[PDB]
Amino acid sequence: RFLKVKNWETDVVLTDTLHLKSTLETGCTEHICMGSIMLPTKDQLFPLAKEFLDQYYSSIKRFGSKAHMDRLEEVNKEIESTSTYQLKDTELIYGAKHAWRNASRCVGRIQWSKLQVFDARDCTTAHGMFNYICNHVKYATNKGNLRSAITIFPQRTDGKHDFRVWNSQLIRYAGYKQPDGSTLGDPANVQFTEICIQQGWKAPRGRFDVLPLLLQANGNDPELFQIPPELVLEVPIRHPKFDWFKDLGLKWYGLPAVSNMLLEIGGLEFSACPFSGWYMGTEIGVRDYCDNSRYNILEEVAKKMDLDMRKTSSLWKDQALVEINIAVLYSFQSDKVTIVDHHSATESFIKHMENEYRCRGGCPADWVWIVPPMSGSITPVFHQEMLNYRLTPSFEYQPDPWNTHVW
Amino acid sequence: RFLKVKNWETDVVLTDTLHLKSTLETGCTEHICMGSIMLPVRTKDQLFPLAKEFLDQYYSSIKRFGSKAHMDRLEEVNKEIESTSTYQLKDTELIYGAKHAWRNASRCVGRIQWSKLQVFDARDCTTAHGMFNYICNHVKYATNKGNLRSAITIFPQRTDGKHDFRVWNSQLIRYAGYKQPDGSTLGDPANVQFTEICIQQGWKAPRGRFDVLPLLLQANGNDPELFQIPPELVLEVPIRHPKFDWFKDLGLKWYGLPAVSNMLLEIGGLEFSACPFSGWYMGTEIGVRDYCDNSRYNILEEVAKKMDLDMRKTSSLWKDQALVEINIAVLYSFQSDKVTIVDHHSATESFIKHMENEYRCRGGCPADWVWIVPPMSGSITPVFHQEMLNYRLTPSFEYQPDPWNTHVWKG
Ligand code: HEM
Ligand code: HEM
Ligand SMILES: N=C(Nc1ccc(CCNCc2cccc(NC(=N)c3cccs3)c2)cc1)c1cccs1
Ligand SMILES: N=C(Nc1ccc(CCNCc2cccc(NC(=N)c3cccs3)c2)cc1)c1cccs1
Ligand SMILES: C[C@H](O)[C@H](O)[C@H]1CNc2nc(N)[nH]c(=O)c2N1
Ligand SMILES: C[C@H](O)[C@H](O)[C@H]1CNc2nc(N)[nH]c(=O)c2N1
Ligand SMILES: [Zn+2]
């Protein structure tokens, strides 16, 4: 019931108790581990509300005060009457910061307490949503000095008036299937790109076309909006040694901003809650650029480097991978757009785990996601035992809106 | 019940039913995943069901389930258990059991090879000198002048737990480690404690950076005894780089034959506490882990200095650059000397084909993602993108406590 995690490089052992608070289920059982699977009423609501308010009042050292008891009663009376309740601003801020704190797949959580929370619960239309979003993009971008932020649209009601951003990230590139059978642009976004087109977007049909936003307010049909180009900070990718690299014509955007997740606080569900931070270099260089199902540029780069591509054992893929990632980091740094390398990010996360173990009694972490997609064992997280469990408030996956929406 | 796994690169979806045969527990529950935790004397009572389930599996594999031979064997094992408290495996069952323990090893990326395993039966062994001889024969056989062949040697099973056979070495061939008065380590830091036990037992340490450790062998629960492997049987590869001529002057080498000697083999309830097995290396084991772990040889700094990389900031990726060059060096060296090695690209590609094969013919393939994905260049290998289900099947290889922690010294 009290669990130990060991770091095998430093021998440091931590004891975890925080997991006993866990309420949600993992997918695993005593007989089978599913650690590597990507996706494993009035009655229901009051316990969820009480669990949340208890931790909130505990966090401000007011557990069991009249202010605590009164709030419990007020929310209780509100659920009984309205079948829902509203969070105070202070609770909403706390809940959003803790959903990040609890995100077991996030290596950047040393930052969790510095999150700017934009309350967009007064929003009613897609144009209103667009305005909030552009304001978020501009705030977070901060001319390259990126700042973490979340914008929180109205909470789920009867479920037929959902607010949704249809985009998977606020800023992402289009993918087009070609007459050839090849793919132009980002193949991850082919389907959404076609949804935009069929909704009415005039696609440039290039390699790096910023997708328009598709915004759904109040369960209404979603509407298209172009993000002002001036708000989309982009980085041309060059190499500090290889002159020819810039002629690959690579670029990426500076602001990573997830927009398809669901934020759960105190049993209330926020289906539109776009949040942003900044990139770890490997996300672009290893995953966006080198995944076979993504821009898949390893072949073209290795050719420019004149490496022996005859045999896998020459490690030509590995050599080309390192250079692509050097270029990504060099380009962002040269343009003064915030980025973190995997060495620095993982070192930070280890320090964060140690803070959380002493200040909180644990830190849920999903090793499969936390270890970087290159150079695993030369980062300290590789050698760190981690316990994965689900705490609330949380960010959760939700079905893509096009399978769900009734037009 | 059916469980599906998806490859996120190919969209190939697989359906697992083999997990239904799993009995041993994982460490995980509905409320906690322990998938990254390194480590998460039987009665007659528990023994016959274990034996029965094993023999049912064996008889099924040879297409003789329910035959007169199957039934007579069950009855004979039953009689042997209730009268002698244990039983003996037939040679064929032993071979089947050792191969299946490998087939079932969820942390093993080399399992495409599982059916080609040379099994040496050393159950007639009685003394440490007998064990030494068996082990030398195994090394010579497996080494085969560089053309490595997989093999396992199986010493007598546990009886009362007071007469265990044990190889104290963690691998048959491994380098010594020496902690100096100034707190630095000479040689391999992983083997410091074991090196210290060898010295105490009487080993004359050469005290260099790559001294092959003596074997420390325990027969029949007796105090272990020291033996030196004949150096002529220990194939070693000097490490050089195809382009960087200064690489050789780092003075690096490694042994060709990886041979695990500290695991326990469980077949039909029987426990084989000394069962050394060997195959060949995947390059990253040496180049990433043995050479570049901070707690091992730790050569990254010296390599990047010699490459004159920018080391002032981690964001130059000097470590990642030095890492690739060392791993190229390892593969180049082994290939040039004609010693079997597999690169992590080839090994993971083969594993994915193995795994798909197993899903089709066997109904599943238990795999531990944390272990299967190589320690460098993770996502450019196909396993990174493969969902895997981890569960425990018997026969199996298991960890066991280091023998110096539990041994009753006779003096
Ligand atoms: C401040 C800089 C941050 C860094 C460097 C960072 C780093 C990362 C990285 C690298 C991932 C893996 C993504 C992938 O492989 O697809 C991730 C996952 C995640 N992070 Fe962050 N993070 C940051 C800030 C944030 C913020 C501000 C939030 C929310 C408020 C957040 C919540 C998450 C969540 C929920 C996941 C998991 C997503 C999923 O399961 O698909 N992170 N983090
Ligand atoms: C034929 C060539 C083989 C290759 C390339 C290979 C590859 C590997 C590698 C790279 C590991 C991980 C080692 C580590 O990180 O510590 C491993 C684990 C393992 N393999 Fe193999 N393997 C081979 C043959 C064998 C054989 C012959 C057996 C036994 C009959 C075996 C049983 C295991 C077991 C039990 C583990 C898990 C060890 C542990 O949990 O500590 N493998 N395999
Ligand atoms: N369809 C897929 N499934 C899939 C499932 C889950 C996800 C989650 C990806 N999330 C994007 C993300 C989330 C969190 C952080 C980041 N990166 C960042 N640095 C930040 C974003 C926001 C704050 S920090 C990116 C992606 C694909 C595939 C993946 C690969 C090939 S296909
Ligand atoms: N003491 C540790 N704990 C630890 C726990 C388990 C293991 C297991 C190591 N197993 C060695 C091994 C096993 C299986 C295969 C190989 N390599 C091979 N290619 C083969 C060996 C035999 C057949 S194939 C090596 C090692 C250390 C630490 C490691 C790193 C920092 S601390
Ligand atoms: C199947 C496997 O779980 C999947 O490929 C995971 C592995 N680890 C990951 N880690 C991160 N950070 N992001 C991912 O998308 C993945 N993909
Ligand atoms: C804590 C973590 O589970 C530990 O470092 C593991 C990770 N994956 C591994 N994978 C392999 N093949 N070998 C290992 O020793 C490890 N170590
Ligand atoms: Zn698990």
From Swiss-Prot, chain A:
Chain sites annotated for binding L-arginine: Q169, W278, Y279, E283
Residues that, per the record, bind (6R)-L-erythro-5,6,7,8-tetrahydrobiopterin: S36, V368, W369, F382
Tissue: Isoform N-NOS-1 is expressed in brain and colorectum. Found in the Auerbach's plexus of the enteric nervous system. Isoform PNNOS is expressed in the penis, urethra, prostate, and skeletal muscle, and coexists with the cerebellar nnos in the pelvic plexus, bladder and liver, and is detectable in the cerebellum.
Location of this chain's protein in the cell: Cell membrane, Sarcolemma; Cell projection, Dendritic spine
Binding site for heme b: C106, Y397
Tree of life domain: Eukaryota
Changes after translation: Ubiquitinated; mediated by STUB1/CHIP in the presence of Hsp70 and Hsp40 (in vitro).
Subunit comment: Homodimer. Interacts with DLG4 (via N-terminal tandem pair of PDZ domains); the interaction possibly being prevented by the association between NOS1 and CAPON. Forms a ternary complex with CAPON and RASD1. Forms a ternary complex with CAPON and SYN1. Interacts with ZDHHC23. Interacts with NOSIP; which may impair its synaptic location. Interacts with HTR4. Interacts with SLC6A4. Interacts with VAC14.
Function: Produces nitric oxide (NO) which is a messenger molecule with diverse functions throughout the body. In the brain and peripheral nervous system, NO displays many properties of a neurotransmitter. Inhibitory transmitter for non-adrenergic and non-cholinergic nerves in the colorectum. Probably has nitrosylase activity and mediates cysteine S-nitrosylation of cytoplasmic target proteins such SRR. Inhibitory transmitter for non-adrenergic and non-cholinergic nerves in the colorectum.
Domain comment, as recorded: The PDZ domain participates in protein-protein interaction, and is responsible for targeting nNos to synaptic membranes. Mediates interaction with VAC14.
Family: Belongs to the NOS family.
The protein, known as: Nitric oxide synthase 1
Native source organism of the sequence: Rattus norvegicus (Rat)
Shown residues in whole-protein numbering: 299 to 716 of 1429
